[PDB]
Structures are given as C-alpha cells and as structure tokens.
Write a protein of this length. Sequence first.
Length: 551
Amino acid sequence: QDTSPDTLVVTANRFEQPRSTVLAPTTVVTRQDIDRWQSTSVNDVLRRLPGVDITQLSSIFIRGTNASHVLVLIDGVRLNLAGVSGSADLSQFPIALVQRVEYIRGPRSAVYGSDAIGGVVNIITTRDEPGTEISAGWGSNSYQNYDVSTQQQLGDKTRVTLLGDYAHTHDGFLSKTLYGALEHNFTDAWSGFVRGYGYDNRTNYDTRKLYSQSWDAGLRYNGELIKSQLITSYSHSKDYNYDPHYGRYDSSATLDEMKQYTVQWANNVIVGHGSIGAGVDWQKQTTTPGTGYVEDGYDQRNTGIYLTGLQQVGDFTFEGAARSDDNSQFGRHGTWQTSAGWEFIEGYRFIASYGTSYKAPNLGQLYGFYGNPNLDPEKSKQWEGAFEGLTAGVNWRISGYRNDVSDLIDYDDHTLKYYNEGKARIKGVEATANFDTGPLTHTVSYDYVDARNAITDTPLLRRAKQQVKYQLDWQLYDFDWGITYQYLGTRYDKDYSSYPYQTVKMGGVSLWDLAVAYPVTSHLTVRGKIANLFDKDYAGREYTLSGSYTF
C-alpha cells in the first residue's frame, strides 16, 4: 500500500493535504495494490487494513464496532447504505470501480456528519492512467471476470474515462457495471466533472436483483490560496428480493427503491502554516417499498455546516473540525474533534486526539425488516494517543484509543434485530509498520480491540480481540510475489442450543494467501492467486488466474 508521508489524501478535510499532516491514522490503497492483491471484492481490500475484522454474507467489525460505524464515501459522497441490510450492502459495490481507497481511522463526524465514528473509508473511482486495459480472470467456483476500461484525452482540457465490467462468482453472484466520467478544465483554476455509473447485481442466496445508478457533477476552483468545490449527486437503486419459484411480484417478494440526493459546498484556504475550511451540505435519502408511490415510503434529510483548521506552529501541529447537523428525524447535533502532534525530534511525533461523533439511525435501521423505529442516535466520545517515528528505515506508528459510545447499536443474528447495547467502551491498540529488507517489502499491522459494555463490563460479542495482518512483497526474476497473512483472534459468541444460553469463546483463525504476477510482455501481465493456502476450514482453498493487456 501507499505508505509515504508525502502522499496526498483528500479524505481528512475534503481537500488535498499530505498524509503526514493528517494526525489521525490513515491508510491509502492504490489500484496497483488492488491489482497485485487481485482482490475480487471490496471486503478483500478492507480485510487487509488496520482495525478491520471481517469474516465471510459477512460479519465486519472495525475498531470494535460494526461496519456501519465507519462511514463509506464514493468520491467524497456518502454511499447510500441505509437499505434494509445496512452496511452489509457494501459488498454489492463493484471492486471494478475502486481505483483508490483512503481510510482514516478515528471520528470524523465533525467533517462528514452521521456515521463517521470509527473512521471514514473513501473509495475513489477516478485515476490518472491514460490508455486502455482489457482484463479478465477465472477461478474457483466458476469465477469469471471481464473488464474493459479506457481513459482518453479529448483535447488538452477534457478527459473521458469509460469502464465496463462483468463479474460472476458462484448461480451465485452476477455483477455488471458500467462507469463513465468526464473531467474538464475550463481554465487552470476552474474545473468540472460529470460521472455516472451503475451496476446490476444478481444474488442467489432468496433471489436478489439490485439495480443501482449514481450520478455526480461537480465544479472546482483551485486558486493559489482558495479552493472550493461544489458537488451534486444522485443515486438510485431498485432492490428486488423474492423466491424465484414465485417471482418478483409474489406477495411475499419485496422491492425497495431508494434514492439519495446530495448538494455539497466545501471551501478551503491556505492561511499561515496550514489551512482553514468550511462547508455546508444537504442530503436526503428516501426509500419506497413495493409500490413506487413515495407516500408509501420514508425519508430522512440532513443539512450540516462544518469548520476545519490545520496549523503547524514550530514543532506542533494542531488540527480541528466542528460540525452541526440538522437531521429531519433526529434534530440538531454538533460534533467536534481536535488533535495536536508534537514532533519532538525530527522523524518522531506524539499525537493526542479527542473527538465526538454520532450516528443517527438511518431508514433501514428504523423501518426495515431488522430495525426498530425507536432507535436512538449513537453518540461517541473518543480519545486517542499515538507515537509515530521513522527509525532505521522502519516507518511505524502505535496508538491507544478509547471510544465511549452511548446507545451503541449492535445487531443480533439470533433475534434478527438491531438492538441498543447501551453504553459501550472500546479500548484498543493499533500498531502499524512498513519497511524493506533487500527486495522484500513488509507491511504489518496489529490491533487489540477490547469492546465491553461500560456498565456491566461484559465483552461485546463476535469481535476478534486481536488482529494481525502481514503483507510480504517482492520481485525476483520479474515475478512479483505477495504473501498475505491474517490472524483474527478469539471472539465471544452465544451458544443458543441450550437455555440458559451460554457465552462461548471461538478460536482464532489464520489465513494465508499467495499471489504472483509476471509481465509476459510490456503489455501483458499474467496473475495467479491462491487464497487460503492451507485450506483452513474455520470457505477453503481457492485459486484465481487472470491477465491484463494494456494498449
């Protein structure tokens, strides 16, 4: 992954800044990473990153809360995950479109609003890579993938990107995506873009057909000091779930049509040794069940306004954000965060962070099959302290955090319902490092996640307490190898066979993957992967084989 302190991210305050000036822990994944890892799903990308505990249908915890506490953006715009299945729908999003992922841990409601409690994951779909690639893959369980994309300059000012992708995984999960983007520089300072994409996913679990489209248009001003962006988005999905013996109209079939509209205006200016920024946005999500008549459905709206600042004063860096949100269902809620870094000697820094964040129950949690119209907003207070250094070629960081959540919402697989866990306290350690030894590059992370009910002190269920992630990359005789190791430690779950239901500890699981790639020609790269090398049943050993031809 991209581990340079100099790499630019946009996800911390919406505008470009070096990762080294973001005081919260950041991970950047590039399309190169994705391509080398040969990931076939967004989960395969996420599973690799600090704090993320994914077991595959998938149970995901990030820093001790379920994935709904991490806000997912596509190109800076909230991905509608307010459907019946909540954040589980992240797995419907096509890997073909992830060109980069910026992942910043820790609260960021003070910039983005509801849901950014554990972190923010921004799946960026655009990349500067002109030309044409044809890709395809085959693998275990009749896996088939075919992909064409091209990115062409249509004059000095205009760039069009087009992509189509067919993916079929066992009839299992079929997923067809199209994507087009227009990027235009009216002048050197003014730019605009229009991007549209969609996918039709068919899943046999009990048949699901999801048709989704998302359109975004934006204007950007990039001045010497002042930067502004105005973005409007619209996303629409129709989601059919039915028994194929009876079809989509059967009385027990469901159709949920969802829409999300966003208008967002963000500004930033370079001032002193840093920047300040502010922005306002309005967002609305709607859902309508079987009928198509919006009177039959529900909607939630939100208007927020936020302030951000970054300043370097001598060896100190101060960073803050504050936001106030007006939610049509939950009213007004403010959040704020601040961090201070002290580079006490060059290359080494201590960082202390504090922030509040919240999550307002969304349409699915309130009115969907699994929900409850009486859910309260979840509110979080987080403290984190970090030590990072560069030592003898080793880029490292370790932090401790604590997250006190009021009215944390967990989901109970047994009752099939969200429920309010009450007050939860998560205490955690994150360590990361990367370093090279000769031809080997090592990317390592460790997490300890101690999530408890703060009142009774009882561990929260289904969370791995430890996560070890190790990636090993090297190139030898033009073969590029990547070994991935993951350990997800011991978890607690309920044994429902006998009443009273006992809490039982589940074992940790180790999984290994081996990937290799060879540039057959300067245009043709051939890739293979063995996932779950040791065939661990705990979803066993799977192979994949693919090629790309760049024009």
